[PDB]
Write an enzyme that holds these catalytic residues in place. Structure first.
Site, PDB file in Angstrom:
ATOM      1  N   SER A  19       1.342  -7.975  -0.719  1.00 57.55           N
ATOM      2  CA  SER A  19       2.159  -8.345   0.679  1.00 57.55           C
ATOM      3  C   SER A  19       1.147  -9.499   0.799  1.00 57.55           C
ATOM      4  O   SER A  19       1.399 -10.956   1.678  1.00 57.55           O
ATOM      5  CB  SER A  19       2.390  -8.040   1.583  1.00 57.55           C
TER       6      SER A  19
ATOM      7  N   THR B 268       0.611  -1.686  -0.060  1.00 56.22           N
ATOM      8  CA  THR B 268      -0.048   0.216   0.578  1.00 56.22           C
ATOM      9  C   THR B 268       0.866   1.467  -0.036  1.00 56.22           C
ATOM     10  O   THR B 268      -0.016   2.280  -0.445  1.00 56.22           O
ATOM     11  CB  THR B 268      -1.088   0.021   1.343  1.00 56.22           C
TER      12      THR B 268
ATOM     13  N   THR C  74       1.200  -4.288   4.086  1.00 58.55           N
ATOM     14  CA  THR C  74       0.862  -4.516   5.640  1.00 58.55           C
ATOM     15  C   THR C  74       0.638  -5.878   6.106  1.00 58.55           C
ATOM     16  O   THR C  74       0.934  -6.495   6.965  1.00 58.55           O
ATOM     17  CB  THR C  74       0.000  -3.727   6.173  1.00 58.55           C
ATOM     18  N   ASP C  75      -0.275  -6.169   5.331  1.00 54.47           N
ATOM     19  CA  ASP C  75      -0.853  -7.574   5.257  1.00 54.47           C
ATOM     20  C   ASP C  75      -0.213  -8.709   6.038  1.00 54.47           C
ATOM     21  O   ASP C  75      -0.092  -9.545   6.813  1.00 54.47           O
ATOM     22  CB  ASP C  75      -1.378  -8.224   3.808  1.00 54.47           C
TER      23      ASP C  75
END
Lengths: 330, 330, 330, 330
Positions: free
Chosen positions: D60, D13, D93-94
């Site tokens: 990710s 992101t 972030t994931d």
């Protein structure tokens, strides 16, 4: 087609400026007028018809009761207008929670009232104020906001103006409630998960239209080896109620109890709050014999919130039993 | 084989009694002697050789600086004894965080020191004190506790006495730190996840053995429409430092700044803390020109903690630059 | 006149036993019958007229859909009885949150329904179960509980059965909601601060009276290098919907998207939840094109909650737009 | 002279783009190359000598084990260079938490390694990535960061890569640790309050230089009416270890225990984690007889973190006692 939202500007970090983009924490509050705030978020025109007014231009740590009355009276004039659908107040963070609670008690309107600030100035890298202000306008324009009481819309949250507090310094998640956020605002849409339980706005017994002055209320802190000095000095300089920011469950030092009994007999209302502010509440007759002493407990309200409720309540009553009812209903 | 642990009792809710088993919140503190507390946890004998002493019998909201010195000097005597492996202090919750931080600054020992209380009295259904005391003795007897500074062991957690605070009223999870628990204690075993970063105990420049009487330090609160009255009255009545419990990032009302400049000119140290206590810290020169005014910021320390550090620091120095260094190291 | 409360026992830690008083975490669940549980809190008679029934005797990690139906049907029979004012269910913690949400969806009654467990067995020092059960009966007996949906009363809190979850292991504060507690229960009295916003009980479109079986629904986890194996295996062994416990905002690996498209075409509903469970929600059409693929997002509901809502919803509809409406209203 | 920092870009992101400034939550990840990210923060030149490399360009949630190894091996080459003082990895972030923990286990360097992402794309109003990337470079260039293990610098915090997790969806405070932040980063300066207790980087027994391919490890979820299907299917399709994401304290359904005994007898490691991720840990021999079954508990580690440690551990050992020691030290 679009809602008519008025932005009332009071100053704050959201209107602030720092010396460079890296200055997220060191800045001067209350530098930009309401027209520059609106000009800095051109996307507001997509979600509402916005007009701005400057009510004051202050760092909110320096707000006065005359400021609260001026803001409260202007909000009431706008709420009575058929041309106004919702109201946004831009505000410094330091006393945002006090203003939001004050408006929750004295504005007898179901029209949305949103109070918003920022933790970084608009000059900073990753400044939070632009999206906070967009969200405030989105929430003030949303039918789901009607009748929900005053709201605060920072960190993509919809927080109750009753019990949201500035809890974390520096970070953009600064404003928290013991009782949780009521919702979230994301890409202009509001998502609700809880409703208020406590009396506010249209169901309030208080009305700014009938308030021309506020009684003086002060706050004194509790800690190891605290003495009665601040309590007496505050009363001697005009306090009509003292908020005791006690340790634990509003506990009072044996060194302070006698002065608080003497102050109560001298007509000063004694309200036990605490500096234990992340959850729980102050229980009547638990740490001190409030019935015997004719004192009041602040329930879950932190000291600065208890001061606001006490001041508004004392425009109407000085009866300690009535004040305790108020502290249990609002 | 078993560690020698001394329990120093000071009173509190853990020594309290209420009228019925359902009275978890309405009770009298400081009713039971240390031998009754020990007898209430016969399982202590499984994990340590325990002995009890009654240092004082108080509700901790009424603690004095002379009480801190009596307790700190008894801890120092026990730490110097070959026959003592660890020390547990049973204490009221209200000022537990103040005592724990004080001992963390002034006890020059790597022997474990654990401060423990309870939110419910031993007469209540589901009273928390029995397991809290067992856990305190388990942590005080564990080699992993050596050199960790003063610890607080409530709610199955190992918290740092530096920055744990009473944050939630009523509930057994009352004690929290912005920087998290350092560990947990479960079925007598300690599980560590973080270490302290700040100076404490054996690495402290301060020593209880040198202190005869602590300097007077008081706390004044910041809120909407605050005046200089409390600050001036506390200084008039002997404050050598004033902890400012400001809104936001230790912010000071324009109505208060001139008084604090006059007080600093007259030799009173001015320390900016806040009532924004869940996270973050107060940044030097951000909300006020500390360098220009010769003021100090309290960093992440809440007002009652900043008071403890200011008292200990001023046993060594009146130099505001040294006080700021101490507020950045401890 | 006291409320008539029925306690329905299902097992769990609250009915559990450990080898000694120091065993707070190592025990056997579901050993004590309902009459011994009630006899352990004789103070229940001060707040309600209580009787006990043993519905089942299980460790809640081993609950089945047939157990939910049995419990749901018995709750419904009691709720229809003029002799029953409130219902308490004693339950293991592991799936307490699944049972509480299930009942919130299918019990069309305004009579209070409270689900309660404990983190320590009643054999343990400082066992939490006695006050939790007292509080559950207090809340089930309180007129303020009517129409509030299913409630969970641990850690002195009133939590919504909708969105409370087992969030912290070992500690008594285990049950948390992203949207906060709705209230507290202290010394038998209920203190409310929020109301539910979502559809429940009397305003639910679902009714246990019309449900004789539950569709099979399974959950698969998302992580680095996840493959489509679990998803396909679960569908091959009868899953009618799959809850995707995604990373982030319900994100799906590019390695798993094709299998989910094939499974959706084969008639398996695909519901995107997440293992990001402390706040926020899964946004439709953000991480994946839900409209193009005919998938559903679980909104704020964690994977096990989403499973319960999917299973109840699919007793009535397999229309993916209807299921998305349900995930947005409940 | 400024520190030499290398930014290794992987996508996410932070490199994403939305359709308009109000698109904070709906966007495409992994659109912008490392040179554009660096160009978007011209202030980086004030705090370090930065250069960028594009290691990969992914969302990710779709990361593989071979991607971890490619990034880990590039980090190792840069750490071995005299011309590199610090390393920043821009990441989705994931699975940021999985990459950060992996690097913490396998990079045998004391040079700072920072992993950073954003919750909003750089195209959004109030995008968080600019200040997060500035802060990452500030922390990577700080002497205080040496020897601290892998760090994550979002939301003004310094978080340990070991145990920080994506815990809140949508909001910029997404990354949280049960054990708290270790520090904060404000106006380019690092403020430390805790240190790591667990083994990492230079004190790790593992080294990226030795690993050619990671062993296959998968995760199965525990919930009401769960069956053995996912566990068996994941093992049939090559899992060398199964992470059990159990209810409560890693509890296992009586429907699943027999399959897990059979899988262990056939050489598959069985690691009990949980979906109870805000605090506490999974206690050995509490919910299941791990010694009898030769199973492992994941301690405090969430399922996706437990998978990372299990993969790394099994590059060295298949002894369940050694795996349990690793789960207790890292």
């Amino acid at each position: 087609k679009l809602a008519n939202v008025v932005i009332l500007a009071t100053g704050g970090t959201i209107a602030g400026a720092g010396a460079s983009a890296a200055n997220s924490a060191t800045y001067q509050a209350a530098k930009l007028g309401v027209d520059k705030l609106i000009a800095g978020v051109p996307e507001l025109a997509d979600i509402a018809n916005v007009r701005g007014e400057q009510v004051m231009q202050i760092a909110s740590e320096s707000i006065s009761n005359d400021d609260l009355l001026k803001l409260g009276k202007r909000v009431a004039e706008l709420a009575e207008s058929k041309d106004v659908d919702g109201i946004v107040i831009t505000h410094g963070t330091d006393t945002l929670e006090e203003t939001a609670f004050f408006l929750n008690l004295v504005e007898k309107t179901d029209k949305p009232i949103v109070v918003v600030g920022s933790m970084r100035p608009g000059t900073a890298m990753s400044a939070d104020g632009m999206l906070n202000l967009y969200n405030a306008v989105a929430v003030a324009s949303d039918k789901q906001s009607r009748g929900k009481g005053v709201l605060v819309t920072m960190n993509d949250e919809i927080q109750s103006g009753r019990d949201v507090s500035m809890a974390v310094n520096i970070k953009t998640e600064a404003f928290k409630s013991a009782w949780g956020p009521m919702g979230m605002v994301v890409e202009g849409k509001s998502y609700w998960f809880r409703l208020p339980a406590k009396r506010h706005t249209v169901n309030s017994e208080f009305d700014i239209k009938q308030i021309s002055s506020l009684p003086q209320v002060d706050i004194a802190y509790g800690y190891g080896n605290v003495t009665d000095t601040a309590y007496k000095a505050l009363a001697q300089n005009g306090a009509k109620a003292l908020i005791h920011a006690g340790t634990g469950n509003g506990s009072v030092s044996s060194r302070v109890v006698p002065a608080l009994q003497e102050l109560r007999k001298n007509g000063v209302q004694i309200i036990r709050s605490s500096h234990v502010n992340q959850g729980g509440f102050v229980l009547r007759n638990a740490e001190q014999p409030d019935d015997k002493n004719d004192w009041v407990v602040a329930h879950d309200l932190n000291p600065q919130k208890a001061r606001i409720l006490a001041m508004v309540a004392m425009t109407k009553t000085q009866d300690s039993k009535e004040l305790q009812r108020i502290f249990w209903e609002y």
